[PDB]
Enzyme design. Structure first.
Site, PDB file in Angstrom:
ATOM      1  CD  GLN B  11      -2.785   1.183   2.445  1.00 39.71           C
ATOM      2  OE1 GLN B  11      -3.649   0.307   2.494  1.00 39.71           O
ATOM      3  NE2 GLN B  11      -2.636   2.095   3.395  1.00 39.71           N
ATOM      4  CD  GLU B 254      29.817  12.281 -10.524  1.00 38.38           C
ATOM      5  OE1 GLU B 254      29.472  12.649 -11.668  1.00 38.38           O
ATOM      6  OE2 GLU B 254      30.670  12.890  -9.841  1.00 38.38           O
TER       7      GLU B 254
HETATM    8  N1  GTP Z   1       3.864   7.619   4.062  1.00 37.10           N
HETATM    9  C1  GTP Z   1       2.965   6.658   3.871  1.00 37.10           C
HETATM   10  N2  GTP Z   1       2.939   5.549   4.697  1.00 37.10           N
HETATM   11  C2  GTP Z   1       2.017   4.573   4.494  1.00 37.10           C
HETATM   12  C3  GTP Z   1       1.096   4.678   3.463  1.00 37.10           C
HETATM   13  N3  GTP Z   1       0.308   3.581   3.490  1.00 37.10           N
HETATM   14  C4  GTP Z   1       0.700   2.786   4.507  1.00 37.10           C
HETATM   15  N4  GTP Z   1       1.750   3.393   5.142  1.00 37.10           N
HETATM   16  C5  GTP Z   1       2.496   2.864   6.292  1.00 37.10           C
HETATM   17  O1  GTP Z   1       2.722   1.490   6.066  1.00 37.10           O
HETATM   18  C6  GTP Z   1       2.617   0.757   7.268  1.00 37.10           C
HETATM   19  C7  GTP Z   1       1.734  -0.464   7.053  1.00 37.10           C
HETATM   20  O2  GTP Z   1       2.175  -1.130   5.895  1.00 37.10           O
HETATM   21  P1  GTP Z   1       1.299  -1.173   4.548  1.00 37.10           P
HETATM   22  O3  GTP Z   1       2.099  -0.688   3.362  1.00 37.10           O
HETATM   23  O4  GTP Z   1       0.020  -0.385   4.709  1.00 37.10           O
HETATM   24  O5  GTP Z   1       0.928  -2.737   4.454  1.00 37.10           O
HETATM   25  P2  GTP Z   1       1.138  -3.599   3.114  1.00 37.10           P
HETATM   26  O6  GTP Z   1       2.437  -3.268   2.417  1.00 37.10           O
HETATM   27  O7  GTP Z   1      -0.045  -3.390   2.196  1.00 37.10           O
HETATM   28  O8  GTP Z   1       1.194  -5.119   3.644  1.00 37.10           O
HETATM   29  P3  GTP Z   1      -0.121  -5.940   4.091  1.00 37.10           P
HETATM   30  O9  GTP Z   1      -1.350  -5.074   3.947  1.00 37.10           O
HETATM   31  O10 GTP Z   1       0.011  -6.388   5.529  1.00 37.10           O
HETATM   32  O11 GTP Z   1      -0.208  -7.161   3.207  1.00 37.10           O
HETATM   33  C8  GTP Z   1       2.042   1.680   8.322  1.00 37.10           C
HETATM   34  O12 GTP Z   1       3.010   1.904   9.321  1.00 37.10           O
HETATM   35  C9  GTP Z   1       1.702   2.959   7.585  1.00 37.10           C
HETATM   36  O13 GTP Z   1       2.043   4.096   8.338  1.00 37.10           O
HETATM   37  C10 GTP Z   1       1.122   5.787   2.633  1.00 37.10           C
HETATM   38  O14 GTP Z   1       0.311   5.880   1.718  1.00 37.10           O
HETATM   39  N5  GTP Z   1       2.058   6.776   2.840  1.00 37.10           N
HETATM   40 MG    MG Z   2      -2.277  -3.824   2.608  1.00 37.36          MG
HETATM   41 MG    MG Z   3      31.662  13.328 -14.336  1.00 39.56          MG
END
Ligand code: GTP
Ligand code: MG
Ligand code: MG
Ligand code: GDP
Ligand code: MG
Ligand code: MG
Lengths: 5, 440, 428
Positions: B11, B254
């Site tokens: 996500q 670099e």
């Molecule tokens: N900066 C930012 N952080 C995000 C975002 N979406 C999720 N997070 C962070 O990602 C963490 C959770 O992981 P996710 O990426 O949502 O989960 P996933 O990669 O989809 O993995 P699963 O859903 O468990 O299969 C949390 O700590 C959130 O704060 C986003 O759109 N922007």
């Molecule tokens: Mg997810």
């Molecule tokens: Mg150069």
């Protein structure tokens, strides 16, 4: 230090 | 030549990917239907923007990217979103059941069902490259997919591409927007597994970005859309050297040479400026000298560390916009005087600078003011180790009672894999301590 | 001893190489397309030294352009004299060297070196009598430093009885913020002590200080730095390019300048110091050319010649002037500052006078000194080197390309020997 012909 | 393939996992990875490619499009004058009126090289090109974008006969400019998620909701929004026409469907890869915030599910149970398909699609992109430079991998530390699957992919990519560079943009967990209690676990696991498979990893601390949004943009309760739009600007700064080119431009590789003194010490600290609202930016223009100063204000750091209490091993400045060598040189001279900035005795103290005259743009309905010039500092400081420490402590408190460990064992992992991962982290903190010590 | 084959490697090499050809072309009255349009006939007497002849009597430089990325060479080819060079003598790759000596010398460069030597061989067969080669390059990068030294080692194998000459740009933190340059430079020096007969130590620390202090340029550019190099290169090779009596070929120069095989790192000086913006309406007096050309401010190496002793000196005066007065002022310095010249090499200062002056000047003086003070330069690099190597810092970039720590230790060791050898004869 930034230095271009 | 020197193409760069972006991989957006989970996500966070995907949603940040949306912000980034939207912004890239605005920077290069690319419409959401892929068409680019500027480009006269139809069907092909050697230009700087071609490192991130391929071209088709139709005149369509296509992102060299892949979006992967083990559950369709987030990527589905891309498929139906404003920039739906920008991608080819084979680039958007979804599962059905996510990893339920479980590293084991992301790396094994669910991940194994899709890893071959992803690699097949990554491979198909690599075949479009006259000379692939490497990969950029966007992912969260805390998610099951972001952590587990990312490690799996990175391991597989080391095998299928040997030692082509692999850079990470890793979202470090913050309590203000944490979604799982076990994010410390997932973090330590993915960090350990990926460590020897990543050449350079830029950590994004959500708490830092949350803080900056609240403080500098006066956003009451920041959303993901808020954080992403700021994060994207920073990623854009870092990849600017790859996507644009001018006389004063310094390639990211670099900077990478200076930033990584040892293979494991590959986590640079990012600090970006100016982050300012349109209200404050009106009638107030920020000089090269001003933004450069901000880079050393910890309030503008991307990770919550204190470089003051640590030692510097490198300093890079990635300028963009209205910046001339004269002003930069004078600006750093000031900071050399007005700060102290201690370096380790074995490193030189020069600042490697790059400049891209292409100014920062901003996304419509955005929170950030459109400024004439901006800068991102990449520094290798021992203080970054603080990030590992806070996370390692959270990990220690739960593993002491084996809390939640059963969700991992049930999917096939072992307690050994936990203690092993934790020991690597202990070694890394130790390493980051060793480099700081003075020589004899 | 007639034809010289020029080679330029890497970014720095091709930039100064191009500027060098720009200058001497103008001096020899050769235009960008290669036709001659000059007054004096002195311009065409020894034109065959650096140029070949073609149909329509067009003059083509005997130059080989080498790089591991197409960047600089595409710029040179669209540069001012871009179309002058033999199109086939452009030999470039795409991978780049990433400021890595290992990539340039062992992996990425090894993949390209054979193709370059094919162009070298083709030019060397066109020669009625080849003297040797002059290389232009930096020691701080990857291509010019790494691949350059590889080409030397390989060229010495095919032409071991020929003379190897180099214009080597030494790195300085005042100009580059790349941390690994001391590694590249130390590795290169080791190669140069072994496999060159003559090396002009062009120090970027000097060129910057000259630009900032003397020429009062607050933001010196590469073009400013190169204007100095271009002027030096013209002067140093004047005795080679026009009819003369002293140091008229590379071997004779080497015999006069090199008392010992390893100590062949020359300290170039020049006067009057000029910037592309400077007016220079007032030509200098012969005494002024002399007092400056021996002044540390005019040295291109950033060493204090008063800290060492001159083993040998070559002095070249250009323009119409009193050859009588030249001898008196030259003899004056020797007799005034006699302590700074070694006594065990009698008459170690030799002088030549060419009538044709450099572009834009009526009176010019060039300096070539084999001073023992050159060690200060190698000492500088050695310290920058050890600062990192004692902690084995940034070595993974090199070990990843197949190198080993031992090869660094040997290069460090050999350059420490060089410094001591320069010191051995300073106290003689
Ligand atoms: N900066 C930012 N952080 C995000 C975002 N979406 C999720 N997070 C962070 O990602 C963490 C959770 O992981 P996710 O990426 O949502 O989960 P996933 O990669 O989809 O993995 P699963 O859903 O468990 O299969 C949390 O700590 C959130 O704060 C986003 O759109 N922007
Ligand atoms: Mg997810
Ligand atoms: Mg150069
Ligand atoms: N004087 C001068 N020095 C240069 C120039 N370009 C690069 N350098 C120096 O050369 C070093 C970098 O080597 P470079 O030639 O760019 O790398 P290469 O392409 O691998 O040979 C640095 O110490 C620079 O200061 C130039 O045009 N003029
Ligand atoms: Mg195009
Ligand atoms: Mg290859």
């Amino acid at each position: 230090x930034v230095x271009x012909x | 030549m020197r193409e760069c393939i972006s991989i957006h996992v989970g996500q966070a990875g995907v949603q940040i990917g949306n912000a980034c490619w939207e912004l890239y499009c605005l920077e290069h004058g690319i419409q959401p239907d892929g068409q680019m009126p500027s480009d006269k090289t139809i069907g092909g090109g050697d230009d700087s923007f071609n490192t991130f974008f391929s071209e088709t006969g139709a005149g369509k400019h296509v992102p060299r990217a892949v979006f992967v998620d083990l559950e369709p909701t987030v990527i589905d929004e891309v498929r139906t979103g404003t920039y739906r026409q920008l991608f080819h469907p084979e680039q958007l890869i979804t599962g059905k059941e996510d990893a339920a915030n479980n590293y084991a599910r992301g790396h094994y149970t669910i991940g194994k069902e899709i890893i071959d398909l992803v690699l097949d699609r990554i491979r198909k992109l690599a075949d479009q490259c006259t000379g692939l430079q490497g990969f950029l991998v966007f992912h969260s530390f805390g998610g099951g997919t972001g952590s587990g699957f990312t490690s799996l992919l990175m391991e597989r990519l080391s095998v299928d591409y040997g030692k082509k560079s692999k850079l990470e943009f890793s979202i470090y967990p913050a309590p203000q927007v944490s979604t799982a209690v076990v994010e410390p676990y997932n973090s330590i696991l993915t960090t350990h597994t990926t460590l020897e498979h990543s050449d350079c990893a830029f950590m994004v601390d959500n708490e830092a970005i949350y803080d900056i949004c609240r403080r500098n943009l006066d956003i009451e309760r920041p959303t993901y859309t808020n954080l992403n739009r700021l994060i994207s600007q920073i990623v854009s700064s870092i990849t600017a050297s790859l996507r644009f080119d001018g006389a004063l431009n310094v390639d990211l590789t670099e900077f990478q040479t200076n930033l990584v003194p040892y293979p494991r010490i590959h986590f640079p600290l990012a600090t970006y400026a100016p982050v300012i609202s349109a209200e404050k930016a009106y009638h107030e223009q920020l000089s090269v000298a001003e933004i450069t100063n901000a880079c050393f204000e910890p309030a503008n750091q991307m990770v919550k560390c204190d470089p003051r209490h640590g030692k510097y091993m490198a300093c890079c400045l990635l300028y963009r916009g209205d910046v001339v060598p004269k002003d930069v040189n004078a600006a750093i001279a000031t900071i050399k005087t007005k700060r102290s900035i201690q370096f380790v005795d074995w490193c030189p103290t020069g600042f490697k600078v790059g400049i891209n005259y292409q100014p920062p743009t901003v996304v419509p309905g955005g929170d950030l003011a459109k400024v004439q010039r901006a800068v991102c500092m990449l520094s290798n400081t021992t203080a970054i180790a603080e990030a590992w420490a806070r996370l390692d402590h959270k990990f220690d408190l739960m593993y002491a009672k084996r809390a939640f460990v059963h969700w991992y064992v049930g999917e096939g992992m072992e307690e050994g894999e936990f203690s092993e991962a934790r020991e690597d982290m202990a070694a890394l903190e130790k390493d980051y301590e060793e480099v700081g010590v003075d020589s004899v | 001893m007639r034809e010289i084959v020029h080679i330029q490697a890497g970014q720095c090499g091709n930039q100064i190489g191009a500027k060098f050809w720009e200058v001497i072309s103008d001096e020899h009255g050769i235009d960008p397309t290669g036709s001659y349009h000059g007054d004096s006939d002195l311009q065409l007497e020894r034109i065959n030294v650096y140029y070949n002849e073609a149909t329509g009597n067009k003059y083509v430089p005997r130059a080989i352009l080498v790089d591991l990325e197409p960047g600089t060479m595409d710029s040179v080819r669209s540069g001012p004299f871009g179309q002058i060079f033999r199109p086939d003598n452009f030999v470039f790759g795409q991978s780049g060297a990433g400021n890595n000596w290992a990539k340039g010398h062992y992996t990425e460069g090894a993949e390209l070196v054979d193709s370059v030597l094919d162009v070298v061989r083709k030019e060397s067969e066109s020669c009625d009598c080849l003297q040797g080669f002059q290389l232009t390059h930096s020691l701080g990068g990857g291509t010019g430093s790494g691949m350059g030294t590889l080409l030397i080692s390989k060229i010495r194998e095919e032409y071991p009885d020929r003379i190897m000459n180099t214009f080597s740009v030494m790195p300085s933190p005042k100009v580059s913020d790349t941390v690994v340059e001391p590694y590249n430079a130390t590795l290169s020096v080791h190669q140069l002590v072994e496999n060159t007969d003559e090396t002009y130590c062009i120090d970027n620390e000097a060129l910057y200080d000259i630009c900032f202090r003397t020429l009062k340029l607050t933001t010196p550019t590469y073009g400013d730095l190169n204007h100095l190099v271009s002027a030096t290169m013209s002067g140093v090779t004047t005795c080679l390019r026009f009819p003369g009596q002293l140091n008229a070929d590379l071997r004779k120069l080497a015999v006069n300048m090199v008392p010992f095989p390893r100590l062949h790192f020359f300290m170039p000086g020049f006067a009057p110091l000029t910037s592309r913006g400077s007016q220079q309406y007032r030509a200098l007096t012969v005494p002024e050319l002399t007092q400056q050309m021996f002044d540390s401010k005019n040295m291109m190496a950033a060493c204090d010649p008063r800290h060492g002793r001159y083993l040998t000196v070559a002095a070249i005066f250009r323009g119409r002037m009193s050859m009588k007065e030249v001898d008196e002022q030259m003899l004056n310095v020797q007799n005034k500052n006699s302590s700074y010249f070694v006594e065990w090499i009698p008459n170690n200062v030799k002088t030549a006078v060419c009538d044709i002056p450099p572009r834009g000047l009526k009176m010019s003086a060039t300096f070539i000194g084999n001073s023992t003070a050159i060690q200060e330069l190698f000492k500088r690099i050695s310290e920058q080197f050890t600062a990192m190597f004692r902690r084995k810092a940034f070595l993974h970039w090199y070990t990843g390309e197949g190198m080993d720590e031992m090869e660094f230790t040997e290069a460090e060791s050999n350059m420490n020997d060089l410094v001591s050898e320069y010191q051995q004869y300073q106290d003689a």
